[PDB]
Each structure stands twice: as structure tokens, then as C-alpha cells.
Amino acid sequence: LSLQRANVEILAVEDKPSPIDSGIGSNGSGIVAAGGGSGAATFSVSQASSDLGETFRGIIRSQDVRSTDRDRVKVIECFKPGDIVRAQVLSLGDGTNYYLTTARNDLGVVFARAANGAGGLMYATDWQMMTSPVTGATEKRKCAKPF
Amino acid sequence: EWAHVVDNFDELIPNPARSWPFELDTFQKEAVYHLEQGDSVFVAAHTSAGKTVVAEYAIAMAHRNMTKTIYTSPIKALSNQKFRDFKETFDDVNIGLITGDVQINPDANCLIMTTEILRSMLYRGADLIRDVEFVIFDQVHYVNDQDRGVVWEEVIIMLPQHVKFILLSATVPNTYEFANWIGRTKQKNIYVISTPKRPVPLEINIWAKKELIPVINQNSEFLEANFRKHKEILNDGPSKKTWPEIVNYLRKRELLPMVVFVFSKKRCEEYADWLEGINFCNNKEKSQIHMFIEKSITRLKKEDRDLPQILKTRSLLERGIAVHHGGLLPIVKELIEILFSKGFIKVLFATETFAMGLNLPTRTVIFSSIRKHDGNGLRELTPGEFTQMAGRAGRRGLDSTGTVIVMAYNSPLSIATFKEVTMGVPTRLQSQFRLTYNMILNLLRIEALRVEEMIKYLLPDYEKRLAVLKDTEFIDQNHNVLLKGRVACEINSGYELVLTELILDNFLGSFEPEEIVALLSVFVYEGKTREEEPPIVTPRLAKGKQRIEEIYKKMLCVFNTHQIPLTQDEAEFLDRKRFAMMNVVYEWARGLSFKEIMEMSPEAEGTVVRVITWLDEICREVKTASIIIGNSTLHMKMSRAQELIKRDIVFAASLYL
Amino acid sequence: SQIVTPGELVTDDPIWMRGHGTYFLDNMTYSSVAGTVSRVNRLLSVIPLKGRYAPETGDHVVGRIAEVGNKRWKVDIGGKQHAVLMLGSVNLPGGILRRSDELQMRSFLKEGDLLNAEVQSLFQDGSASLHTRSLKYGKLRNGMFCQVPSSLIVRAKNHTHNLPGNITVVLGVNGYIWLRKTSQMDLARDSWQIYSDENDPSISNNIRQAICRYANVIKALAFCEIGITQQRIVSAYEASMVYSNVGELIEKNVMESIGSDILTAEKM
Amino acid sequence: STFIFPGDSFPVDPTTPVKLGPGIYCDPNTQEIRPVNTGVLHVSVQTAYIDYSSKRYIPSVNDFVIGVIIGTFSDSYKVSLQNFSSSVSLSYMAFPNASKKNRPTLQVGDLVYARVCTAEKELEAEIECFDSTTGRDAGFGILEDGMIIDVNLNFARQLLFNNDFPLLKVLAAHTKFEVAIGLNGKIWVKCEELSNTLACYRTIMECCQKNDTAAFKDIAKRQFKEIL
């Protein structure tokens, strides 16, 4: 997150996982990122497209978070790192990132955790609120409409 | 796609967006009704008729519809005043300001900016334009200039199709053409609304020998018998017992609020000083004014509040007397304006700039004389200027009529000149389209673009100027720009050829940054004073004076060899004393309290700050020329000079914010 | 003039002001390149014998789109750096602020396209800024591309010429050349389709043959190191009609003969 | 008052509310208060925290720091507070009497004295060159010339906040000097002569290498005699 945009990684394209193999277990024990092991420094750049576990990347600009009042949007009051967000593609962008938008009632946060990913799951309560069931604490999000 | 001229409201608009505690005029109702239908409106009504009601209603409509509004004025002076007025008037609407100096609340729903700011914003393609519903142009009749004309037309052309327009101005001969052009270019319906007459009437009087003679009534009908009696009773300039003879006659008539127009910076101070033993504050107004002044000037540094101008203004303001001219600091000028707007000043001596813009009306307007000196000799006032000055005399509601007094100083005035000045159709101004060497050099670098065929839609002059440029090796025989011409293309202010010759002659290579900026003030200060120059400057900075004068003299001989007509500024260059400000600039850069500087400077505090401000552009141009020729020694010298002439007082915040 | 080499003393007079191509120590001035000494009033500088094209304000250039960026394009014009073309410096068919065109810039210009532009201003380091705000500039079509060194392009006031055989040539200052079929705008010189990739569907064989011959004679002129002008191009085209086959103009002896004939005819 | 280890029992009554300071963690799953650092636990509306030894700085609001300009952007500077750490940002409007015409004139490589104003967990920290809480401008801005000294965090805290720490008093008895103290582990000094600045640098380095505050005077005397 920053003050101007949010960076995401694409996990599924129309209810189909992308890629099929996520690379889990390729780096051994512990909790490691896909490119955080020993094989990342010995990948053959000139004989393949990308390395094991690489995904498409996207960018959500603050002016694309919603369709109205798109000059007073606070990014940290909408998303947090680690959230699962449903978005729609606007443009192919450059070779690094797509461009995405959430400016519709069915787009936004679908899964989130309390304490910035250290706690349990929360459930959506209002258009701009989620609630923790174990302790009745509330946080601000841009909730995608359920049901 | 057409312009329409127009000349059951309660049922038509049962739910108005805003309400006022008075009955609206017909033109206001028409403007409101046509704004409620979704059409653009052109309003051309007389002064002090209530044009700002339309803008307030537009802002209220935008707030109700949750859209944005942009307000634009040609003059940056009016932006701050309108910002303060709108901030006071509206409490539920966020107000913002965007100028070349400040930027407050860019995300607000109501924005006030300048035309060039909007031009740059449109060029950048800002995202806030998509939400804009109304754009308001105030004081349209002041945009008929050359520099103000192109930007306005470009802004009008570049605007998108979902933006509606509101236009406000005065009664001018060219009114239907602007609306027709806008409605043709944008293919929108716009209605032209005009008012019959002034809501408050004005009268013209003549003062002679301790009484006032009404000579024109409220119907603009001349009275010959009164003028004849004025001629009979009188059978030069003001005396030391003249302004007291007027400040008491009008005081007893309950017509006290007075604005006197004197066409001289120095004469206003003398006239104000001649008023001795006159007061208007009894015991509490003085204390309130003292508190306001003390709080306002807190933003300055402690040693900058002792300047003689501030002390004199404070002493005068405690009695209800003030002056308004271009020789004051901006803070003092805006302080005087704010105090005048609060009804604390009774007598004001003002220059011509007060009438232009500066929405601060009064009750009485007195003309010291009907003639003024504008550059080249004396000239009787044009009817347009007289109408502009005299029109600021009747405030709606608080006044039943507007009084105007024309003085007569122990000498009768001709009646034909009076009739010509007061009665007559005003004429729109025009420009002679001066041709400069920078324009010619810039046009020669453009691929294709046959120059001669565009000048027609000046030709004998263009050929003569090309011969000069080829003689001094700015261009070659095929009219290709050389290295010398490229430098001159980047110098815009006043003197391209003389400055270029100076730079390429290894001048400025021996002096220090403090001395370089001191010598360059000759191109900024016009030397209209007559006071003695400093007899001693330094052993150096006097050789620099001789070198500049010799180079200018050599360039002047080349101009006369080719028989080129010369402007007044260029002809009388060495005749004026344009080197008088070297010492002031030299000590400013060296580091010296601005109070000690004013003890020896030949110009007021307001003039000194203007000179330093104009010297910022000169340093930028010389820095650019150093990159073109590849002299890094000159580049670092000019960078140091810029940092040496910056002080806190030149960046003082406005009192309107 | 005088030929100097790097590290050579030019003058020891403490009266000159130093310019490009030199460095100094106290009153001694030295050369940093191989070139010729130039004097303008009190300014002293050295002009290099070889170098890349250096853009100047007002230049007429031909370039290729290299990168599609954030509200800007990168254009290759053969200099030391890429030029910059802002999105606000071009003309859009529909408009700029319609209630897109920032995320859809590839619908107008994309990587590999050739275009015609003018230099608007120079940045601090010499890189150029381009604009396409006239009907005479834009996308190039209906012809062929060729390249010559920029030092062989003679400076002139006009850079677009109509040639016999219904052919038009665009002579770039940077040395990039475009040959095409003459259009209505070219004849008149003497909305949404301005970004189209389609060529004219009625280009005949005679025009193709003429374009081939013009390219061959331009390459022949460049081989002999003769400056390229419109008059020389026409003269070389007319003098090559002896050979009936265009393909015989690629031999070295024919190119040298054409160049020598042009020079001899001019010198007479 | 007592020495504590991570995983130890927390000696505070669960009924009384206590505000938590550094070194103490509240579990997001079990809502349990436990210590995570090793050191001395101080208990003062009462506040508890653990004093532990550290060298790597982590930004916190209302801290006085010294930074280096490493890059200039369109609207702000890029500032480094420690080698190999994530950078912070300093805005062009974070100077006194700042406007779009009164731009700052700092370059890449300058030293600055500032205050931490924003330290959000999900964002990049921000600094300002004036105390916005009080409107005071006490020493914030560029530091010209001088020399920079690296120390650990406890030493910097002792210098800045403890008035009974005797180093500044013993230094003032040898020379006149200027000083700025940053809680990120930086000290800036300057004297009129280079030899005095060098002696101050050597004295500060040697005093930081030691732990006994009673030997500062002898160290200062020996170092100032060394430079003759």
C-alpha cells in the first residue's frame, strides 16, 4: 500500500486457479516466498518465460477504488495487506502490471483477518465495516456485497 | 448553437437553491430561471447592480447536485478578495484557492483560480474536470488585451462538452459577438441578459470658492445655467488650506466617506500631510485599529516592523486617513484595503489602480484634475477612465445617490473639454503590435512558415530589422540562426541584443555575485526619479557603468544607421538615471537590515521589493545562456546571486488568507 | 581552420572566455576533442569532427516509437538519448476529457510506428521534447524508409518536396528519410483516420518503380559523400535513366559515376 | 526494577488497566499480555515497558532524528536514517513558511534534523522539519559542515533525555561547540577549529565504547592533551 495506489497479485481468473502449481514446498521448510529460495538465483532467463510460482501483477489506483468522490479516498481505510479482493480489468497496462478497478457494488474485499493478518477471520457487517466475532472489534474496509 | 437576446416565477421555481432577504430584479430572476433549465447565461448589467447573486445561486445549485464549480478572474488581485468573501458567505461549502503563489484545499468542491492555472490544468488533463458542472468568468470586459486574450480563447476552446458557462461583465459595445462565438464554438444555447439603467443614480458637481454647484442631475442632462454661474463666480493647483476647506463642508452634510483620486504617488502623501488636526476616532476606534494593526503585522520579523512606512501608516490610520499607491508593501496595502472594507477610514487618497477591480465602493468621489501624464506628455482623461472612476460612488441600499465632485483651483475650466470627457461614447482600446527582435529570431527557427505572408494578415519595418541582425552576426546571409542568435532567443524581458553582446564580451567574469546583480539592475529600474545619485559607489562598479554605456552607445549607432524608428524607452535610456539603485541592491545582497537600507535609498519600500522581484527573472535567463555557450563558471556565479537576494519579507503571507 | 587534438594547448592569453570542447587551468586553455578552433567575439571553443545528431528547437525530425509509458511516449530519433512526446502534445480525434484515453494510448501509437514531429524545447541535458500539434505532422504511411548520416543533410528552410513521378520526400534533419506517394495535402502545399495503419488501396506499379529508383539514387549520393538536396536528387534521378533496370544502380562503379557526373555538372 | 525474559510471567494484576510500552506484546489470538524482550522491566494511568539493548532503529512518532538526502522527487525528498534500512519521505511543504514559490534548496548528500510525524504500520514513515504539535522551530533544518558519530540507541537516549549524564558538561569545560542529538543513533558536532572537532569525535567514540560514566573526565583530558 501507498498513498496513491495498491499493489496486488492475481490468484484466479474467472474461478480457475492461475497458475495451476503455486510452488508450495519447493523451497523447503518454514514460510518462504516463491522467489525467496536457492533456485531463484539459478533460473535460466533465456530458456523459459518465468520461474516456478510467478503470477500476474496488477495495480489499483486510488481514483479507481470507487466511482464517486474519487479525490478524497484513503487507501488504508479501504484495503490492508493480505486481503482477498475481487476486481475487474480495465487495461493491459505495461509488461509488468495490469490496471484494475473495484468501482461497483459487487467488487471489493471478500476475505480479511483482524490485527493485520495475525488474528482470526472477520465477517462483513455494512458497506464499510467488518466485525471480529471473538471480540466485538470493528475495522473499516470497502466490503464487496455478499449474497 | 445560437445566442438568444432576452429583454409565474414563484410556481416556476417552488424550491429555490438559495434565498435572499430582498426582492430580486427582473434580470436576476431571468438568470435564475434559465440556470434552472440547464442553459448557459450571459449577463451584461451596470455596475453595483448585483451580478454576484447569479454566481452564489450557481454555487448553491452545484452543492445541491453534488457537483463542482470553478471561478476565474483575469486579475490575481481579485482572487484573494473573492476567496475571502465566499469563505465568509458560505458555511456548508468548502472553498479552495489555486494561484501561482498558494494552493489551499485542492480537493474542495468550490475552486477559485486564475485563467492560466486552468489552462495548465486542461493541458495536463486533470481528473477533477469530469465532475465540473459550472465555470464562471467574472470581469469579461477586462480580457480584451493581447496577453489576456489568447489564454481566454484557448481555455474556451479546450473545455469539454459537459460544462456549462456563466459570464459576467459590464456594458460594452462588443457583447453579442462574444456570446455568439461561444455558442457557435461549443454549440450551446446561451441567453444574453442586460439591465436598463443603474439601480443607484449618479450626479456630477463642480466645486469653486467654498460651495458646490450641481451641473448634471441624475438623468444625465447637462445644466447650462449652473455652468454659466460657475464661470461668473470665478471672476492652478491646490493650496495648503484647500483640503481642510473640503473635509469640513462634506463632514457636516453627512456625506463623509470620501475617495480622492490624485495621479501622482508623491502628491498623495503631501495632500495627506497637509491635513493636520483632523480626527474621526474618538476613544475606542483608535484602540481597535491599533489592535488590528498589531495582530496583523505579527507575521513579519521583529526588526522589519520598524520601517518608516509602517510607522507613518500606523500614525495616519489612527485618525481615519490613509493613502493607496504602488509604492507601499503588499502587506500595508492589503491592511489598508481590509480596514477600508470595515468602515474605519473616512478620507482616502488613492491612485488609478484603486478603481480597477478592488470591489470597495464609497459614497463620495472627488477628482483632483481631469488630466494625467501617461508616459509621453500630459493628456485629458478619456471618457472610459472617468466612467470607471466615477462609477465607484454609489453603494446599493445604503445610498440614495452617487455624488461626484470636480475641483476648480482658482481658474475656470473649459466647457467643451468637460462635455467631451463626461459625455461621449467610449471606444475600445487597440494595440500597435510592436515587433521585437526576440520574436523575429524565434520565427526564423520554425521550419517552413513563410514569414512575410503572415505579417500581412509592418512589412517595410521587417526588412530593416533583418539587416541589423545580419550586420552584428546574429544570422548569416541565408538567415540561419547562429550561436549568438540562439542566446538572444532565450532573453525575453527587455533588451536581447545589448545583453547578448555583454555576455559574449567576457563581461561579468571579473565581478563577484553581489556585484553582478548590482550592475544588472539598470535593465530593471527605469530611473524615473530626479534625485541625486550616490556620489560615491566603489572604485569598481564604476568601470562597469562605463562599459555598459559604451556598449549601449555602440548598439544605438547601428540602429540609427539603418534608420529604425525608436521607442521612447530606448531613445531616452542614458538620459534617465537608471543606475541609481546599484547601492540599494549591493547592500541588500551583502546582508544589511532593511531599516538601514531605507535611510539612504531613493525609492520607497514598495519600489525596492519590486526591483528585487524583477531581478529573479534576469538571473534565470543568464543561467540559461550559460548552458547554451558552455561556460560553467558563469553558471555557478548566477546560482549564488539568486540565493543572496532572497529574504523573508518578500514571501510574507497574504492577510486575506 | 586549425586542427587540434586532445590535450593540446590552444592559447595562454587570459582574455578569452571558454566554451564547449575545452578545459583550462589558470590562464592555459586546452582541447578535449579532435576538431577545429572557433572564435565568436571573446568566446573560444572547439568543434568536434565527428559526433551524433544534437537536437535543436524548431527541428523537423523523423522517429520511431520505442516505449509506451505513463501519459507519454519514448521516440528514437538517432541521438544520444530518446526524445519525449507527452500525451498533451498530440491531437486526439475525440477529445481529452470526456465523461480513458490514458490507459488506451496504444490505440493511437504503439511500438514500432514511424511519425513526423517537431522539436518543441530541450531539457537540461540536451534531450528533446516533441509535439505533433499541426496537420502536417503525424503517422507516416504509403511508402518506404531509408537512412543516411545526418551530417549530409544540407540545412534549408523547407524539408518536404514534390518530385517528378508523383513522389514526395520527407528529409529529416536527424538523417531519417521517408519516400511516399504524393497526396492531396502535398499538392495543396505548393479526423479519426490520422492514426490508421492502412495504406492506400490504389498504389500502382509505376509509383513503386519510381520509389525504388529514388531510394537507389539517394544511396548512391550518400556513397560518394555528397550533401543531399532536392535539386541534386532530381538531377541524379534524371541522369540514371540510361540504365533501364533499376537493379544495376547498386554496383559501386555506377554509383561513383553518378556522383562524379553530378559534381562535374555542378562545377561547370 | 526486575530482570525479565521472553515467556516469563507478567507481574501485573490483570484487573488494573496498564498502558503497554516497548517490549510487551498483546496476543491477537488469546488476548494475553506477555514480554518478548530481555532486559529490565519498569512500572510507573500507569505505564509498563522493558528497557533492552538495541542498535537497529525503528521509526516512532515524536522522535528527533538526523537523516541524509539520497534522492529528490517531484514533490518530496528521499531520506535515509540508517544504512540498509527502508527510506523515509520528507515533504516540500514540511518547512516553516513554505509555499509553492518558497521552495527548499537542499541537495543530494545534505544532513537534516527533523521529527517523525507519521509511522503507520502499512505505509512509509514521514518526517517534518518543524514541530507541528507546538509550532516551535528549535534547531530543525540543515546541518552545515561538522562531523557525524554513530552510537547505540541507549547512549543516544541517555544523552538526549538525562540531564545528569556528565558528558556534555565535561566537553564544555574544554571547548565551545554545537551539538545535535538524534534518537536513530547519530550525533553531530562542530567547533571553530578542526582539531577541537576531532578531539570531540575521539572522546565521544571512546566514551561510547565504555560503560562507566565516572571515567569520562579522564578520557576527555587525555584526548584533548593528545592533539596538543
Ligand SMILES: Nc1ncnc2c1ncn2[C@@H]1O[C@H](COP(=O)(O)OP(=O)(O)OP(=O)(O)O)[C@@H](O)[C@H]1O
Ligand atoms: N436585488 C437586490 N436588492 C437589494 N440589494 C441587492 C440586490 N442585489 C444585490 N444587492 C446588494 O448589492 C450589493 C453589492 O452589489 P454587487 O457587488 O453585486 O455589484 P457588482 O455589479 O458586482 O459590481 P462590480 O462592477 O464591481 O462587479 C450586495 O451587497 C447586495 O446586498
